[PDB]
Design a protein around this ligand. Sequence first.
Ligand code: BCB
Ligand code: BCB
Ligand code: BCB
Ligand SMILES: C/C=C1/c2cc3[nH]c4c(c3C)C(=O)[C@H](C(=O)OC)c4c3nc(cc4[nH]c(cc(n2)[C@@H]1C)c(C(C)=O)c4C)[C@@H](C)[C@@H]3CCC(=O)OC/C=C(/C)CCC[C@H](C)CCC[C@@H](C)CCCC(C)C
Ligand SMILES: C/C=C1/c2cc3[nH]c4c(c3C)C(=O)[C@H](C(=O)OC)c4c3nc(cc4[nH]c(cc(n2)[C@@H]1C)c(C(C)=O)c4C)[C@@H](C)[C@@H]3CCC(=O)OC/C=C(\C)CCC[C@H](C)CCC[C@@H](C)CCCC(C)C
Ligand code: HEC
Ligand code: HEC
Ligand code: HEC
Ligand code: HEC
Ligand SMILES: CC(C)=CCC/C(C)=C/C=C/C(C)=C/C=C/C(C)=C/C=C\C=C(C)\C=C\C=C(/C)CC/C=C(\C)CCCC(C)C
Ligand SMILES: CCCCCCCC/C=C\CCCCCCCC(=O)OC[C@H](O)CO
Ligand SMILES: COC1=C(OC)C(=O)C(CC=C(C)C)=C(C)C1=O
Ligand SMILES: COC1=C(OC)C(=O)C(CC=C(C)C)=C(C)C1=O
Ligand SMILES: CCCCCCCCCCCC[N+](C)(C)[O-]
Ligand SMILES: CCCCCCCCCCCC[N+](C)(C)[O-]
Ligand SMILES: [Fe+2]
Lengths: 323, 273, 332, 247
Amino acid sequence: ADYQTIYTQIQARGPHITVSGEWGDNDRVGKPFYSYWLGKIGDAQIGPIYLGASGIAAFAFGSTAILIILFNMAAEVHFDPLQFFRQFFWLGLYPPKAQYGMGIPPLHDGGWWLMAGLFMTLSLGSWWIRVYSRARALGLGTHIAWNFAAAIFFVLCIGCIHPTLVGSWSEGVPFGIWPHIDWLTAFSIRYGNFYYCPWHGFSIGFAYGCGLLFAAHGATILAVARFGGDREIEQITDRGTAVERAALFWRWTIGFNATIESVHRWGWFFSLMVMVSASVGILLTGTFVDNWYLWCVKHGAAPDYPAYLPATPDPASLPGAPK
Amino acid sequence: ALLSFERKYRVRGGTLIGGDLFDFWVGPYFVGFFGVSAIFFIFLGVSLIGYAASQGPTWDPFAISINPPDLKYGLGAAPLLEGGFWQAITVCALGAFISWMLREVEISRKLGIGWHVPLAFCVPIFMFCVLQVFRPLLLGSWGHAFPYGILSHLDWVNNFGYQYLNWHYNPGHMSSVSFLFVNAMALGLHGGLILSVANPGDGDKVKTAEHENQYFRDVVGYSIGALSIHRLGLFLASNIFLTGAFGTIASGPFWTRGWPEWWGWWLDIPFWS
Amino acid sequence: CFEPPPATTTQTGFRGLSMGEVLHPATVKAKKERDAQYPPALAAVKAEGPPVSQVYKNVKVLGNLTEAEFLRTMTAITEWVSPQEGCTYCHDENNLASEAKYPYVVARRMLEMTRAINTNWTQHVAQTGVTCYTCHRGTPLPPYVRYLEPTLPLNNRETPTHVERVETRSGYVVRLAKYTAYSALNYDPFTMFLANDKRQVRVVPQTALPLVGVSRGKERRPLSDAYATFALMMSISDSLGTNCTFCHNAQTFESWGKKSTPQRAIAWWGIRMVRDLNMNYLAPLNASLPASRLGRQGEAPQADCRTCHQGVTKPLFGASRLKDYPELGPIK
Amino acid sequence: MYHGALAQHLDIAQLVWYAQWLVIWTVVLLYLRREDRREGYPLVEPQVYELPYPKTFVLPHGGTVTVPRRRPETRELKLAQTDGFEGAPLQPTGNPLVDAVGPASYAERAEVVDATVDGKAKIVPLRVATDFSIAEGDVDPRGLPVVAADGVEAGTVTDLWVDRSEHYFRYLELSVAGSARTALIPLGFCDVKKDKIVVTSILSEQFANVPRLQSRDQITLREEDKVSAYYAGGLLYATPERAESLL
Ligand code: BCB
Ligand code: BCB
Ligand code: BCB
Ligand SMILES: C/C=C1/c2cc3[nH]c4c(c3C)C(=O)[C@H](C(=O)OC)c4c3nc(cc4[nH]c(cc(n2)[C@@H]1C)c(C(C)=O)c4C)[C@@H](C)[C@@H]3CCC(=O)OC/C=C(/C)CCC[C@H](C)CCC[C@@H](C)CCCC(C)C
Ligand SMILES: C/C=C1/c2cc3[nH]c4c(c3C)C(=O)[C@H](C(=O)OC)c4c3nc(cc4[nH]c(cc(n2)[C@@H]1C)c(C(C)=O)c4C)[C@@H](C)[C@@H]3CCC(=O)OC/C=C(\C)CCC[C@H](C)CCC[C@@H](C)CCCC(C)C
Ligand code: HEC
Ligand code: HEC
Ligand code: HEC
Ligand code: HEC
Ligand SMILES: CC(C)=CCC/C(C)=C/C=C/C(C)=C/C=C/C(C)=C/C=C\C=C(C)\C=C\C=C(/C)CC/C=C(\C)CCCC(C)C
Ligand SMILES: CCCCCCCC/C=C\CCCCCCCC(=O)OC[C@H](O)CO
Ligand SMILES: COC1=C(OC)C(=O)C(CC=C(C)C)=C(C)C1=O
Ligand SMILES: COC1=C(OC)C(=O)C(CC=C(C)C)=C(C)C1=O
Ligand SMILES: CCCCCCCCCCCC[N+](C)(C)[O-]
Ligand SMILES: CCCCCCCCCCCC[N+](C)(C)[O-]
Ligand SMILES: [Fe+2]
């Protein structure tokens, strides 16, 4: 066994490294501190952290959203603090229950929801600038920011773009532990079973795919740690035995292989395509498709099964049947 | 038919069974004993799917569904057409999967690398066994297993969830979903980070391990490190199914009500009721 | 937090669809024992004599019955509804034709209602039918009733905590939750769907593509309808002690034919029956009941699925007294 | 009915279904599978059209590499075709541990010392990196014996080599008993106990022929490969019956 793949047997300590960027060196804040127990399974150093304006803007905007959500949740239990702690998972901030269309809802029936949504959006946009700009400051590509952008686009699709396209704020995702979960079933029911949305399928293929790829890739690199396989940058610019052994492992198993660079492109693409496929599914839902099951039936794609208990006619359709 | 660096690695050895009787390659593929047994179990399995398909309505491989038996057959054997095919095919499926796992061990040993990949591959084989073998044993019928059709298997997942009113409140499921989400995110960040360093753009220079650590210290105040992100990724992916398995096993044998009602242990504590 | 095996399982769909019931035997056993308390039918009597319509002075419903028969009805009604207080629950000793006690006039309306169930709602109750006992279970107040706002406990024979009481505003979310099988769904499906016939339970379009003129802005039903229908379905499921697959193939909740069991069509008749009971027999009794029996909006207690079923797919596991008491209907 | 009719009224979702599949098969076959072929292609004895133009990297400390590297493979006389069938395993001509073939193979990595961001040597002994220590709580292995596969003590730990970029120990240095020489061992091959270092990968006598560094206080990328590969060779070749089945 390579015990090093499980944990660090002997931890190193040394002076804290700082890589200078084009800007912002003065907005780094805190003294680094080391953690013996973290050091067993990862790097021991916690801190420092960069602030900047995008950082502070994001915390200001985020905190505002959380306070609006928490205050409306406290109101739902009439500010009893014990009931608040008990019922927390069941408490939420809801979009409008009535149909105001794109009408700005009153505060008691969706107005706070729309406030909380706006501040969360400005929080995400500020964080996106932080993720993008830190990459540029250190002379790195912007691959992370474009992945992050797909995730943000998806939250925008379920949060305001879909509601806008069908013309009702009532279709938005409530804030809350169980309430946001309840929306998944309401939305699937309203649109005729999300299992029959092909973009739900694509999204799940890529998500399952991300599990397959990170298990495979994580395990491949631990399997060649003995040969410095974790030093993936210099294995890109100067192929070592680590990534030769890795490539041949996969070539001999499945009959083809990536490079230590290209497998990261596979990883990045599969991750991105979870969010892109999901977004395309939501854009089509309610705009161009009302019932996903009946859409599959219309295209010959839906399976049928024999009766087991007798087929049951719609009573609504029988002669002399009440409303 | 060889990679430019491959020849020096193509030596005899590392097999678990058969000595060098099966110690060879066909094109890029290593064989071994388990390569032969994989092909056996795959050939049986595909034959049975073809035989079953031919006895059924259609040849459209998206409408094909080989289903388990009715519940009344319990753990007994069923007529071929009424779930016998399903039973034969499950055995061949396990045969092929276990063969494939052990083949990866022989390949690992020949290259003198860790066995981490075949060990990781045991996780999905376990979860398949939970769905098709362990949970049906505990409920007393093979009929509780999922059917072999591309679309039909989604209708089984669907009805199984709604047998517990809202499957989303299943605590094992909440854990399983959390790992699936954080894993897909982590793989994006890791993939994106490596590409960002090797490809800064505009004929600028490749960056360093020091730049990797600095990037994440800046953005979230911590960098786990190059080796550790690989161990973490195997950990997050593996835990999708290791936590998921308790949620599936519990549904029927250890819990018969809706999953929301399970949270009664918290909600109905006397002192705040 | 768990229930030990074995579990009892049934099949309600084609093999490999995972459709069917899931039952803890201890829980089935406890309900069977509760429901076994159903008093036996009283010994039958030959129809000797004239009809009580021309013997007794104030019989408006059971007038065609014979003196021995009628007294047999009255002894059944008494053990079913008011065994403790006896005949004097509804009657002045000094005059058995006197309507002076509030329970007498309600009881007459309850006879009309029980006969209307067993006659006009055979599509739901079939040849099993109902007695006074089905709902009342030996008490004047039935143990499972609904007001126009959610109340706890569900069983009115259990004592409320401070937080369960309808006046404690902080317990509302928990009152709502325990009516919807502990879901967080923010809707009262009794007042929305069962108190009257104003709202439609169906929300899912019956076309692949969105119809023009129902699919944009103020012309489309809000998503809150889907949520409300889901909360009714959670309530209906827990009321019968079953799950969605007893009635539906989840492949298409909106489809009949092979995609629904016969139990789903029976449930559809059940929704129509409850609305009839509530609108035309139970809501209007608020004018005949004391204030101590009314809710905070002056409403009479009304019926949901649980009122009869009390956590079983068939009330009292299909126990019938229909052939024992033909005067409770059906009436030709 | 009509010859050539299908039962499909076209809608937007159906259109976007075909387009999505097109985008997926395009990215995989024509971009991802092209990137996959930057190392080891073109293929050899004893593809062409679907290979991309070689890629050029600007290294951190000056210079450029173009991939794939044109450096040739050097351990080709050290293996022999037993058989005429291309699938047949190749047979070593000498001692494969020393000849460095099969799992003892190093890659033709560059004879340069890996560097920190600021141009120092990255992997160096603690006698050089005097600002680096072992964390309070862990075994200082300096002084401890190294026990090989055969139970024999093969040498004593003299130092640890730290990665200065990542703050992570990567090698132990031991004096070999019965020689006037040092050997590096990758920590991945080391079971670190309180009173000893256990090495199951090779026997005691086999530490004699661990690849030697050109220099005492720094190591090249090719040397790191040479050292690491030797011990991995041990897994299959330290004894005759390690390359046999468990039949
Ligand atoms: C607990 C719930 C389960 C579930 C729920 C589920 C959902 C909700 C959805 C899927 C979907 C899919 N599932 Mg499924 N599933 C599948 C396979 C599949 C694929 C047909 C598809 C995409 C999966 C994917 O890309 O993964 C990642 C792997 C990748 C990317 C590598 C490539 C794999 C390749 C595409 C798979 C092809 C398999 C073959 C069609 C089957 C073998 C044929 C034989 C004769 C050679 C297999 C082989 C198994 C087994 C053996 O256990 C399985 C178990 C389960 N699925 C459980 C029962 N699955 C999606 C779909 O679109 O179905 C229509 C989908 O939406
Ligand atoms: C009955 C209900 C169903 C349902 C309803 C459903 C709906 C309605 C939708 C999905 C969607 C999806 N479903 Mg699905 N589903 C899935 C899997 C999936 C996902 C792969 C996919 C994408 C969602 C995602 O990644 O969100 C995780 C990632 C997110 C949410 C991005 C967040 C990023 C953000 C930047 C984070 C920032 C957070 C801030 C820091 C916090 C600050 C907050 C404060 C300020 C308040 C599986 C594997 C199964 C199985 C096995 O059965 C299944 C069954 C069902 N789904 C049922 C059929 N599902 C989505 C989809 O693909 O539609 C086509 C979708 O919209
Ligand atoms: C209405 C129904 C619900 C439902 C019902 C459900 C059930 C019943 C179960 C899950 C489970 C799970 N659900 Mg889930 N679900 C999930 C996510 C998930 C998964 C993380 C998890 C595990 C999946 C699994 O077992 O794969 C299994 C995959 C396997 C076994 C793959 C094996 C592969 C094999 C070894 C190799 C096969 C090789 C190929 C044949 C080769 C051929 C390819 C080529 C080479 C030829 C999300 C993200 C959502 C959302 C967003 O709402 C959701 C909603 C729902 N789920 C609905 C609410 N879900 C499972 C779980 O863990 O629950 C706790 C589970 O049992
Ligand atoms: C397939 C693609 C995947 C994907 C991809 C990516 N995801 C990324 C990136 C990429 C590429 C980044 O680059 C970025 C990042 O940086 O990585 C470290 C990021 C992120 N993904 C997060 C969460 C996440 N991703 C999810 C999903 C997927 N992601 C999908 C699966 C999910 C799910 C599944 O739900 C979650 C929950 C955050 C950690 C982070 C955004 C932080 C933010 O935008 O900040 C908002 C900023 C805040 C500061 C607000 C919150 C803090 C408050 C103030 C705390 C204090 C409260 C206090 C004031 C109240 C007290 C009051 C009183 C008592 C006194
Ligand atoms: C948490 C851990 C994750 C994980 C991990 C890992 N995953 C790995 C490894 C690791 C480490 C490997 O090393 C191995 C591999 O080589 O990588 C390329 C592998 C693999 N993961 C595959 C599929 C896969 N992974 C999934 C999930 C996860 N993976 C989870 C997420 C999922 C889903 C559904 O999510 C799918 C579909 C294959 C491509 C491959 C096995 C090939 C095989 O075994 O060949 C041998 C078998 C055949 C070639 C065919 C057998 C035909 C049988 C007899 C007849 C049909 C059987 C019947 C069941 C069909 C009905 C289908 C119906 C439902 C429609
Ligand atoms: C309320 C639940 C009742 C209880 C308990 C008992 N009786 Fe009753 N009784 C009730 C009603 C509503 C009526 C009128 C029925 C109708 O068809 O309109 C009656 C009627 C009688 C009569 C006839 C009296 C008359 O009109 O002259 C008798 C003799 C009678 N009831 C007797 C009786 C006895 C003996 C009871 C205890 C065994 C008893 N009743 C209980 C309502 C209720
Ligand atoms: C469920 C579908 C019912 C059946 C069948 C019967 N009753 Fe009923 N009853 C029901 C409700 C919801 C209520 C209102 C709550 C209340 O307790 O008032 C009642 C009421 C009565 C009463 C008044 C009791 C009181 O308030 O003190 C009486 C006397 C009564 N019901 C009698 C009765 C008889 C005799 C029945 C069989 C013929 C009968 N009920 C059937 C619900 C249901
Ligand atoms: C029988 C005892 C049922 C159980 C259990 C569940 N449902 Fe149901 N459902 C039932 C009926 C009779 C009806 C139709 C009511 C009417 O008046 O038309 C429904 C309706 C639905 C719908 C809406 C369908 C539509 O056409 O729009 C949905 C979405 C639905 N049911 C879902 C559902 C779920 C999720 C259940 C378990 C929680 C469930 N139902 C149980 C009968 C029965
Ligand atoms: C008392 C007046 C009842 C009320 C209120 C409801 N139900 Fe009912 N139900 C009742 C009886 C006496 C019977 C038995 C008929 C029989 O088949 O024995 C039933 C039956 C059903 C069934 C069928 C059960 C099965 O076939 O196994 C279902 C699915 C059902 N009932 C559902 C249902 C719902 C959803 C109700 C609220 C809207 C409801 N019932 C009310 C008596 C009474
Ligand atoms: C026209 C005008 C004026 C404005 C336009 C408005 C606009 C653009 C609105 C957009 C609204 C959007 C995008 C809404 C999206 C809502 C979504 C997706 C909600 C999803 C989930 C919510 C959840 C999980 C809420 C949980 C709430 C709590 C836990 C209470 C607070 C505590 C926390 C957030 C900490 C939990 C920790 C967790 C984040 C890991
Ligand atoms: C109902 C509609 C939903 C359908 C379900 C969605 C399936 C998942 C999607 C994409 C996976 C892409 C798979 C990529 C696998 C690689 C194949 C390959 O690389 O080909 C090898 C060839 O030898 C090279 O030369
Ligand atoms: C496991 O269950 C738990 C809850 O509900 C189910 C909580 O509400 C809470 C309270 C949470 C907050 C944020 C106040 C905790 C801590 C918890 O552990
Ligand atoms: C080489 O790869 C990586 C790291 O090492 C420098 C990280 O620190 C991290 C950051 C990890 C955390 C927990 C912030 C990621 C995602 C990564 O991919
Ligand atoms: C969420 C806490 C972070 C811990 C993650 C790392 C744990 C490693 C120890 C057990 C798993 C070891 N592994 C992956 C080689 O099997
Ligand atoms: C999507 C809208 C974004 C919100 C705008 C507020 C964020 C402020 C960002 C400051 C800019 C940082 N800096 C110095 C790198 O330019
Ligand atoms: Fe990596």
